[PDB]
Amino acid sequence: QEAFCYSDRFCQNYIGSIPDCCFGRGSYSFELQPPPWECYQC
Question: Which of 7, 18, 21, 40 satisfies CB 3.0 to 4.6 Å to 13 for a cystine?
Answer without folding.
Answer: 7
